[PDB]
Design a protein around this ligand. Structure first.
Ligand code: ZEA
Ligand code: ZEA
Lengths: 472, 472
C-alpha cells in the first residue's frame, strides 16, 4: 500500500497543491509514466536535429580550413557537431521547463522539424552554399521570434491565422513532409538511394563503388553495404508502429548505430584514418561534460540591407504560423481541457512558444514548436505540468552522454527522416479534392516543394495560384 | 415536331432495332449529344500522345543523321511525328468502333496515359537512351496484348486482379499521376520550370537565356517568354473545370498554339531557320491526306534472349491490369447497367481492350484502355453503342487535319501533362492512412516513382515492402 502513501506526501505538499493534484483528478505516478512515454516518443530529435544543422555550413569559414576534404575543416565540423548536441538539449530543456511552470500544460518543447530543414538546406546551403552565412540566419531567428512574441502578446494571432484558406495550410504541411523525406535520400544527409543523371534529373544510384570526392559512382547498383543496413533499420523502425511499442524510432536508430560501431567492418564509422582514430579516442569515454565554445553567441545585424533575406523572414513567419495554429488546439481535445471557447492557458501557451525562440536564436538552434508526437503521454494520463517538468529534467540529464550522440552515422537518420514524412502525409485525406479550385492549388503546392528543392518556392507558387483563380 | 420524326425513321429501322433503342429508353439525338460531349472531353490525346512518342527515339538510327542538332535527323523526326498523329488517330478509331459494334457499351478507346509514358521515357529513353530500341518495345506490346487476350478469353482476370492488395493499386495510380506531372516540367517535353544543379539535384530554372545545345542556362530566373505563356494557358485550362464547360483542355492547347503560330514573336514556333521554313510551307495547307511510310510495321523478335526486357513485360502487365480492373466497373454504376453481379457485356468488354492492342503494336502506338474521361457522355444520356460509333467516326474525320496537329509547340502540352496528374491525384483520399502497414507502402510507392524517374522501380519497391512487413 505504500505506493498510495507517495500520493499523499506529495499531493498535500507544496508541489501537489501548486499543480492542483486534487483537481483534474490524476496521480503522481500516472503523470510520471506519461512523462516517460512522451520523452521516449520524442527523444530522437536530439540526434536527428544535431546532424541536420551540423552539415549546414559551420561557423568556421575558409580561414580555418570548404568542400575539399581537408582535415583542418573536418576538425572544426566535428567540434561544431559536438556543440550542437548540447545546444539542442539545452534548448529542449528550456522552453519545456517554462511551459511546465508558467502554465499548467503537459506538453514538451524542442526545435521541431521543418524550420531546421528550411534554414539549414535552403538559406545557408550545404557547407557554405546559399546567400546568407550562419550568423544572419540566427539574426533572422531572433527577429522572427521577437515579432511573433509581439504579435501573440496583444491579440492578432487568432485574427491572423484564421484568414488563411483551409487548403493552403494542409498542402504546405504535406509538402514539408515530402521535402523532409526527399532530403533523406541523397548521399549528403541520407542513405544514397538517389543520385544525378545527364538525360533525366533523378536516377536510382544506390551505388557501391561511389566517388568519395564528388558524389558519383563507378558501377554497381543496389549493392551498397550501408544502404541495405539502412533499409533493415527502417524495417525495424516500421515494425514498431504496428503492435504499438512505446518508442521505436530511437530503437531503430540505436540498433543501426550499435551495429555501425564495430571497427573493421564495411559499414563502420571509425575507419583507420586519423580522423577515425580521434573520433574513437573521444568515444572511449561514455559520460563527458561539454561546454559550448564556438556557437555560444554569434549574431550579426550588419547584413539586413539586402534582399534574399526578408523573403526568408516572411517564409519563416508563414511556416511558424502554420505550425502553431494547428497542433496546439488538436492536442487539447484528447485531454479534459477544452471548454466552450477557452483553454485556460491558450494565451500563456502561445507566449512560451515564441519566448523560447529568442533564447534559442543565440544558442545554436532554430524556432521550436510543441511536439505533436507527445499525445503518447496524454493518451495515458496526466492533466497538469508534471510531465513537462519531467521531460525537461530528462533532457537535462541526457546531455551528459554526448559521446554516444556525436558518433551516430548519417545513414542511421535516413530512416527517421523518411518516417517523419510518412507520419506527416497522413493529413492529406482532409483536403477537399472534389472542387478544382482547391485541388489545383493543393497539388501545385505539394509537388513544387520536393521537385524544386525549396519550401518558399512552393508557398509562393501556391499562394499566387489561389489568388489568381479567385480574381472577382 | 419533325425532330421526333427523326426518332421513328431510325428507331424502327435496322439501326434502331439492332441497338435496341426502345429498350434502355433513350433517343438518337441524346446519344449523338453524349457522343459529342465525350469526344470533346477526350479529343486532346491526339496531340498529347503524338508529342510524347515522337521525342522517344524515332525509328531512324545514326544511319540517317542523334542529339547533335543535325538537320538530317530533324527531318526524320519531323516525318515520324507526322506519322504518329495518323497512327494514334487510327488506333483510336479502331477499338472504339469494335467496342461500339461487338458490344452495346457507350465507351471510347484510345492509347491512354501511363503505358505511353512508361515505354516512351524509361525503356526507349529520350532519343536513343535506354536499353531496348523502338522495335523491341512494339514486340513487347504485341506479346503483352496476346497474353492479356489469352488471360481474358478463359477466365482468370477476375481471379487475378482481385488478389492484389487494395493499397498498392491506389498508390501506383497516384505515383503514375505524379510521374506524368513531373515529366512535363523539364526542358525536354515540358515548359522548363525544373533544371539541373550541382549541390542539390533539382532547382527552379525557369531560365530565359538558356543553352540550346545542352540544356543549362546563363542567367535570368522566372523570366522565360514561353514559360509565362504556358502558365497563362494553364490558367485558362484550369478556369474550365470550375463553371463546368464541356471541354477546356483542348481549349487551352488551342489558345496557346494559336498564339504561338504568329511568325516573328519571341514565343514563335516557325523561326527563320530552314527547318522552320519547311514546317511553315507544310503548314500553309490545312487539310492533307497522309499515309504511313516509316512506322507501318516494325517488329523484331530477335532480342528476346536478354534481361532488361522481361522486366518491362512484367511491369506493363501490372500497369495494364491496374488500369482495367478499375475504370470499367466504375463507369457502369453511373448508367443503368449494373445488375446484381453482371454487366451484360463485361466478358465482351475485356476482350476488346486486349484485342485492340495487337492491332496497335504494329501500328505505332501503345496499349489502350477505356477512357475514364468519358463519363461526360454517360452523365447526359445514351445507353447503347451510339456514342462509340460516333466517337470512332469523329476520330476518323479528325486525321485529315494533320498540319494543324503536327505543329503544336511542346510548351502547349505541359499544362495538359500537369493537369492529368492533378486529376489522377484525386483518388488519394480512399487510401486507409490510419494503419502503418498501408501508410508506409503507399508513401514509398508514391514517392519513389517521380524521384527516381521510373515506374517499375516504384512498383518493385512497393511490393517488396508490403511483402516483408507481413512475413508471418
Ligand atoms: C513550427 C516549427 C516546428 C514545427 N515542427 C513540429 N511541430 C509539431 N510536432 C512535431 N514533431 C516533429 N516536428 C514537429 C518551428 O518552430
Ligand atoms: C491501362 C492503359 C492506359 C490507362 N490510361 C487511362 N485509363 C483510363 N482513362 C484515361 N484517361 C487518360 N488516360 C487514361 C494502357 O493501355
Amino acid at each position: 500500500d505504500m505506493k498510495k502513501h507517495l500520493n499523499d506526501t506529495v499531493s498535500k505538499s507544496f508541489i501537489g497543491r501548486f499543480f492542483k493534484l486534487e483537481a483534474r483528478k490524476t496521480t503522481f505516478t500516472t503523470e510520471l509514466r506519461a512523462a516517460t512515454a512522451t520523452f521516449l516518443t520524442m527523444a530522437y530529435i536530439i540526434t536527428v536535429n544535431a546532424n541536420i544543422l551540423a552539415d549546414s555550413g559551420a561557423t568556421c569559414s575558409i580561414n580555418d580550413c570548404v568542400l575539399g576534404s581537408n582535415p583542418g575543416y573536418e576538425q572544426c565540423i566535428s567540434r561544431v557537431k559536438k556543440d550542437l548536441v548540447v545546444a539542442t538539449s539545452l534548448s529542449a530543456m528550456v522552453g519545456s521547463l517554462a511551459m511546465g511552470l508558467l502554465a499548467n500544460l503537459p506538453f514538451g518543447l524542442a526545435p521541431g522539424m521543418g524550420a531546421n530543414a528550411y534554414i539549414a538546406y535552403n538559406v545557408v546551403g550545404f557547407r557554405g552554399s546559399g546567400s546568407i552565412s550562419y550568423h544572419t540566419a540566427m539574426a533572422i531567428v531572433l527577429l522572427e521570434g521577437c515579432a511573433f512574441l509581439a504579435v501573440s502578446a496583444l491579440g492578432l494571432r487568432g485574427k491572423l491565422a484564421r484568414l488563411i484558406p483551409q487548403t493552403v495550410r494542409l498542402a504546405c504541411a504535406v509538402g514539408i513532409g515530402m521535402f523532409i523525406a526527399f532530403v533523406g535520400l541523397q548521399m549528403n544527409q541520407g542513405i544514397g538511394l538517389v543520385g544525378p543523371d545527364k538525360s533525366t534529373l533523378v536516377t536510382l544510384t544506390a551505388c557501391a563503388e561511389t566517388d568519395p570526392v564528388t558524389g558519383a559512382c563507378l558501377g554497381g547498383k543496389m549493392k551498397s553495404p550501408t544502404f541495405w543496413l539502412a533499409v533493415v533499420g527502417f524495417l525495424i523502425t516500421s515494425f514498431g508502429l504496428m503492435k504499438n511499442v512505446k518508442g521505436s524510432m530511437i530503437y531503430g536508430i540505436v540498433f543501426v548505430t550499435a551495429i555501425s560501431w564495430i571497427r573493421g567492418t564495411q559499414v563502420t564509422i571509425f575507419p583507420h584514418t586519423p580522423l577515425g582514430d580521434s573520433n574513437y579516442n573521444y568515444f572511449t569515454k561514455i559520460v563527458d561534460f561539454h561546454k559550448i565554445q564556438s556557437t555560444l553567441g554569434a549574431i550579426s545585424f550588419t547584413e539586413f540591407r539586402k534582399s534574399e533575406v526578408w523573403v526568408a523572414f516572411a517564409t519563416l513567419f508563414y511556416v511558424d504560423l502554420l505550425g502553431t495554429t494547428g497542433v496546439l488546439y488538436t492536442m487539447a481535445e484528447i485531454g479534459g481541457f477544452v471548454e466552450d471557447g477557452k483553454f485556460e492557458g491558450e494565451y500563456a501557451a502561445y507566449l512560451v512558444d515564441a519566448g523560447s525562440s529568442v533564447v534559442g536564436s543565440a544558442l545554436g538552434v532554430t524556432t521550436t514548436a510543441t511536439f505533436v508526437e507527445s499525445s503518447a503521454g496524454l493518451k495515458e494520463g496526466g492533466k497538469t505540468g508534471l510531465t513537462a517538468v519531467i521531460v525537461g529534467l530528462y533532457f537535462l540529464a541526457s546531455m551528459f552522454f554526448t559521446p554516444l550522440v556525436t558518433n551516430v552515422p548519417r545513414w542511421a537518420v535516413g530512416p527517421s527522416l523518411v518516417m517523419v514524412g510518412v507520419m506527416m502525409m497522413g493529413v492529406v485525406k482532409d483536403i477537399r479534392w472534389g472542387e478544382t479550385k482547391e485541388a489545383v492549388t493543393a497539388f501545385v503546392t505539394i509537388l513544387l516543394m520536393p521537385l524544386t528543392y525549396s519550401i518558399a518556392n512552393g508557398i509562393i507558387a501556391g499562394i499566387g495560384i489561389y489568388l489568381a483563380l479567385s480574381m472577382y
